[PDB]
Amino acid sequence: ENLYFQSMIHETILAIIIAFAISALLCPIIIPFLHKLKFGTPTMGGLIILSSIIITSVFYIPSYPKIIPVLFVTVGFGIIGFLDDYIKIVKPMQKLVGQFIITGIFAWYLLNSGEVGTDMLIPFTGGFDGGSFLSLGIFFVPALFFIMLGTDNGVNFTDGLDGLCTSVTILVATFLTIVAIGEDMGISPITGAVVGSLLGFLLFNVYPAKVFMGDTGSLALGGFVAASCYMMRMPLFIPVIGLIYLVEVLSVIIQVTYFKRTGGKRIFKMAPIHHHFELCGWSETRVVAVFAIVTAILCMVAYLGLG
Amino acid sequence: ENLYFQSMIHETILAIIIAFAISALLCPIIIPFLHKLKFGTPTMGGLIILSSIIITSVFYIPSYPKIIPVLFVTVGFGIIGFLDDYIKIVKPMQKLVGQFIITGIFAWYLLNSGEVGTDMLIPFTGGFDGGSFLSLGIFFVPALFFIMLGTDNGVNFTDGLDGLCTSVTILVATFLTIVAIGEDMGISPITGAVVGSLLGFLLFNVYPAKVFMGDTGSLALGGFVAASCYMMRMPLFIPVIGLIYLVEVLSVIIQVTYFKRTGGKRIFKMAPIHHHFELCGWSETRVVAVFAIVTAILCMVAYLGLG
Numbered sequence A, B: 001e002n003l004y005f006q007s008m009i010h011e012t013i014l015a016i017i018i019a020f021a022i023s024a025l026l027c028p029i030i031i032p033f034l035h036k037l038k039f040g041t042p043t044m045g046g047l048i049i050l051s052s053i054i055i056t057s058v059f060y061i062p063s064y065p066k067i068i069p070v071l072f073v074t075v076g077f078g079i080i081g082f083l084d085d086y087i088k089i090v091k092p093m094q095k096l097v098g099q100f101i102i103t104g105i106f107a108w109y110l111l112n113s114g115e116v117g118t119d120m121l122i123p124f125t126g127g128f129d130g131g132s133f134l135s136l137g138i139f140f141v142p143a144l145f146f147i148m149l150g151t152d153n154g155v156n157f158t159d160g161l162d163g164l165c166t167s168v169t170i171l172v173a174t175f176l177t178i179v180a181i182g183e184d185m186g187i188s189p190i191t192g193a194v195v196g197s198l199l200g201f202l203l204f205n206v207y208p209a210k211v212f213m214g215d216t217g218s219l220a221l222g223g224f225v226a227a228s229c230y231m232m233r234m235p236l237f238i239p240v241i242g243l244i245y246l247v248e249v250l251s252v253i254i255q256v257t258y259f260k261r262t263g264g265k266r267i268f269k270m271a272p273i274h275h276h277f278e279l280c281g282w283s284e285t286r287v288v289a290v291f292a293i294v295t296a297i298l299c300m301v302a303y304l305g306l307g
């Protein structure tokens, strides 16, 4: 009854603290190791984020099996990023090719097995109980590729300022945790592990950044966001929960297209939009705070789209 | 049934967005007004925080009557701060006298009326259902004064860096909202109004601060934290939920006492402890992030102390 949900809440809160402890303790141990590889701050810090998620989620896999596809996707997107950052020490079309392979294997898992429904919950209709479920069948795979690539690139573009991607993703992952518990899905310990792991990293990533994510990180988290929403039948919530991610890709699409259509004219001071505000006179910290506060308000708005 | 809690969650989420909209829109309107009074950034910005709380909570007073004592206490502590900051443009023992009067009227409300129980829930015992309730009767009033003054001064000492008090209090107020809903207390719209109001202010208070709280703010929020916990029978949770507030007063008590006991020796580089880390080489933003992440982890630990 209430005990079922209580034990789940207690196991999820525990997953957050477990991943927070791992991530916070690995950072001072792995930070000189990453700086030795480099020799403006050491990159490839996404390995700390992933290491923490993998360790925590491995204890929950026997009890919560729906974690496995989510874990495989973030680790899969983390592979492309690990290879990308390895080239960076020792491409846009190559990155899109790598992202295309992982999305395909995930599309295969969703259509062949019957663990989760392919339908999409419409936001302000009446929740999972009442509501309305969008289905297109034939267009399921093209729609998956388009939103998964959009989310992954959107998250990658967000990783431009200290604490930016981390702060925004903590709030997105917190929303998925509250929803995964309340709606009784099976991915709350991994969504929670991402919250804990990112809170640990944020201590060392906040201005002035001691470490940098990724690419190794940013692609992994972008996979997590898209995979979780697909595991919960909520891809239609990504434009609202991840409006920051959406506005980051969209500002680049508008800048690059408009620049070429004109004589090199600019629609923004610089793209992605976080560079635009900086050039407007906004502090690195202002941009990080405004983007996070906006995400928080929109996560609450999204939640009201489940009643 | 579930509808009762659902409507409460929807009314509370609404209170957050309402207070966020008021606070975010008042700031660019009241910021030149406060700078005109001053002529390193304009102070007395706590009036924006309070204005937003009062407007939002006034719509919920007929449905949620338990808001009235909480509202009266923060407005009461906001009065002392408004007078303090007025003197600042045109004291420690005078501040302690003002705080003593408001605490007394609140002590009178708690003992004379039977709206709430005087007992204190012990953290890791078994929650409100099972658990253990600490009672001392005669010592209720002295214990109230000691924790209320400690909390109020602790919150006041936290307001030293850009976004510091705001970030930490958002997390403390979020915890009280989740708890006030789940445990069916009657103060969730005001605890939520504080979350919304502070999220609006944080946009303009984050480094480099456009406005400053208080004193007008800091004392008001310190009253809110102590009053909410008393309305919920959770004062014993303030050392864990507000460990940052506790460590801020405690570091001053240790520095001031040790300095006098010795030949002017220092136990910390500077007190409160936020100045200590800055002098250790920590960024203004690092201190704000570390203190907020710690509060978040401890709020989760505190929650596990309700099962």
Ligand SMILES: CCCCCCCCO[C@@H]1O[C@H](CO)[C@@H](O)[C@H](O)[C@H]1O
Binding pocket: A002, A005, A006, A009, A178, A181, A182, A183, B002, B178, B303
């Ligand atoms: C501190 C964060 C706690 C996460 C809140 C998750 C809410 C889980 O709470 C559950 O929600 C269900 C409806 O959603 C109800 O049917 C259950 O009775 C209730 O226990």
Ligand SMILES: CCCCCCCCO[C@@H]1O[C@H](CO)[C@@H](O)[C@H](O)[C@H]1O
Binding pocket: A002, A178, A303, B002, B005, B006, B009, B178, B181, B182, B183
């Ligand atoms: C997004 C934040 C939502 C706040 C979560 C509050 C949890 C309210 O959820 C309620 O909790 C009670 C036990 O606590 C249960 O008995 C109820 O059935 C459940 O609806």
